Amino acid sequence: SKVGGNYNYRYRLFRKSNLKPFERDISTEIYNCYFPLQSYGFQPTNGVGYQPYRVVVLSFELLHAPATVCGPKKSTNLVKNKCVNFNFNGLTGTGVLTESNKKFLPFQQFGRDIADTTDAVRDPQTLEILDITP
Amino acid sequence: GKIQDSALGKLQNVVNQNAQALNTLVKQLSSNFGAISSVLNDI
């Protein structure tokens, strides 16, 4: 709302058909004839409760392609042939780990059983296929 | 000597139905049942 002129912001008031999720529409064609955008008040005071709020939404993609935005937790050393609790790139589990001959195709990162439970994981920094045996 | 050339389906149905029953019980672990994941470690 600052008097330096920050109150340029505006919203689409009229639209032909509902906007899809994560879709965008920049058009300003005339909507009997009306401009399709309308600007908020946002003077040093708007109406009460109509102050400008800044917003950001974080969308977490979870595609199971190689992960690229990780939390600050540092890795441990890696144990084989003992049953161990583990967290690989966010895949929490529990089992006995073993460097495994059932080699993935080079693009693949997890293996799954008949059930969705994962039977193998590619270790994200030694790059070996661990068998997980429950 | 003719028994070598000759009902086993009525017995194999036991082996096949127990196999299919267990396999179906395992496959239902992949089912979400409305949850955001089929694997509890995800939740």
């Binding site: 059930a115 439970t117 429950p134 | 267990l22 019980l25 672990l29």
Partner: peptide, 29 residues
Amino acid sequence: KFNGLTVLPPLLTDEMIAQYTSALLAGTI
């Protein structure tokens, strides 16, 4: 497989059923 299913062995082994089946044959003949 690992998901809590387990198949238990029968009490009578296949060899024990063969022994009984042999005993029924031997007796019969």
